[PDB]
Structure formats: C-alpha cells, structure tokens
Amino acid sequence: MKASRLYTLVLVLQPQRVLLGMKKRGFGAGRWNGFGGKVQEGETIEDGARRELQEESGLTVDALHKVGQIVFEFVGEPELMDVHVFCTDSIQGTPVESDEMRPCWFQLDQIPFKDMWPDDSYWFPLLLQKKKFHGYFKFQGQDTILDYTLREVDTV
Numbered sequence: 516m517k518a519s520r521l522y523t524l525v526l527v528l529q530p531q532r533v534l535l536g537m538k539k540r541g542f543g544a545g546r547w548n549g550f551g552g553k554v555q556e557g558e559t560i561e562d563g564a565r566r567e568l569q570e571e572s573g574l575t576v577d578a579l580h581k582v583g584q585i586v587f588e589f590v591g592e593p594e595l596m597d598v599h600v601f602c603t604d605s606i607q608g609t610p611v612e613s614d615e616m617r618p619c620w621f622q623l624d625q626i627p628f629k630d631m632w633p634d635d636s637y638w639f640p641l642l643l644q645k646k647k648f649h650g651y652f653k654f655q656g657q658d659t660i661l662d663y664t665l666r667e668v669d670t671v
C-alpha cells in the first residue's frame with residue numbers, strides 16, 4: 516500500500532447552520548471546507564483537530580465528536596491523506612477571517628456543495644443524519660473522482 520499522512524477536518528454544525536471556511540489565496544481558492552490540517556507529533560488526533568480549529572478560525576471548543584474517517588488518494592501523489600472528521604455543536608466565541616481563510620455560516624438548506632470538495636456531496640448528508648462513516652476517494656486533480664467507497668458504520 517501507500518504511506519498515509521494524518522489530517523483533521525472539523526465541521527461546526529448547529530441545528531440550522533454550518534460554519535465553513537473559504538480558501539482565499541492560490542490554487543483551489545474559492546473552495547469552502549471544514550477546518551483542519553496536519554496532525555503534529557505528540558498530540559492526539561482530537562487535540563490536533565481542536566488546535567487546527569483554533570488556529571484557523573479562532574474558535575475554541577472543549578471537545579469534539581468523531582464522526583468519520585476518509586482516505587484521499589490523488590493521482591500523481593504517492594502519499595494518502597488520512598482525514599479524521601469531527602463535529603461539534605457547541606462553540607463560545609466568533610470566527611475570524613485571516614489572510615488565508617474566510618469563515619461563513621450557511622443555513623442547512625443552502626449548503627454550498629458546488630463550491631465544496633466533490634466528495635462532500637456524498638458524506639456530508641450522512642453527517643447531517645447523525646450517521647458515522649468511513650470513506651475513500653481517488654481524485655484526478657481537484658474536481659474528478661475516479662473511484663470511491665463510502666459506508667455507514669456504527670463505530671468510527
């Protein structure tokens with residue numbers, strides 16, 4: 516198999532809205548995503564998720580709930596991205612725009628799927644139904660899925 520690198524992804528999901536961040540600069544600018552990044556040496560995955568949420572958005576949370584895991588493979592990249600997906604409904608501060616990321620709330624009947632990673636159209640709906648999931652997606656570039664698997668699970 517390939518080697519994998521650990522990443523986190525955090526969805527701030529409230530009863531009627533979700534907070535996403537727009538990538539502001541460079542290639543892939545204009546895409547909305549949850550918050551997250553690479554797990555660092557020595558921290559648990561959940562603590563890495565909390566850290567990235569705070570570094571990227573300004574928000575803190577006491578805890579997160581793990582809701583899924585998704586492996587991404589990109590043609591021409593030998594390393595897989597192993598993305599651990601968390602939610603929370605409970606926040607206590609305001610999101611902050613940076614030079615790299617603009618946060619915005621979306622109502623849950625206005626989820627901006629066409630401007631999100633294409634895989635989100637498949638797994639986001641499960642997250643909204645309080646389901647847990649495991650997924651895998653192989654991409655050619657940023658837009659085209661060549662192969663994928665997705666399964667609801669009882670335990671992540």
Ligand SMILES: Nc1[nH]c(=O)nc2c1ncn2[C@H]1C[C@H](O)[C@@H](COP(=O)(O)OP(=O)(O)OP(=O)(O)O)O1
Pocket residue numbers: 522523524525548549550551552553554587596598632633634635
């Ligand atoms: N296909 C996809 N679908 C999705 O919903 N999120 C994806 C995705 N592919 C990547 N991501 C998320 C995972 C993770 O939160 C982020 C990628 O991590 P980054 O490159 O942002 O890591 P870092 O912030 O550690 O890197 P730097 O800021 O460049 O140091 O994008």
Ligand code: NA
Pocket residue numbers: 551552553567570571
């Ligand atoms: Na980051």
Ligand code: NA
Pocket residue numbers: 552553567
């Ligand atoms: Na990082």
Ligand code: NA
Pocket residue numbers: 550551552553571
């Ligand atoms: Na990031």
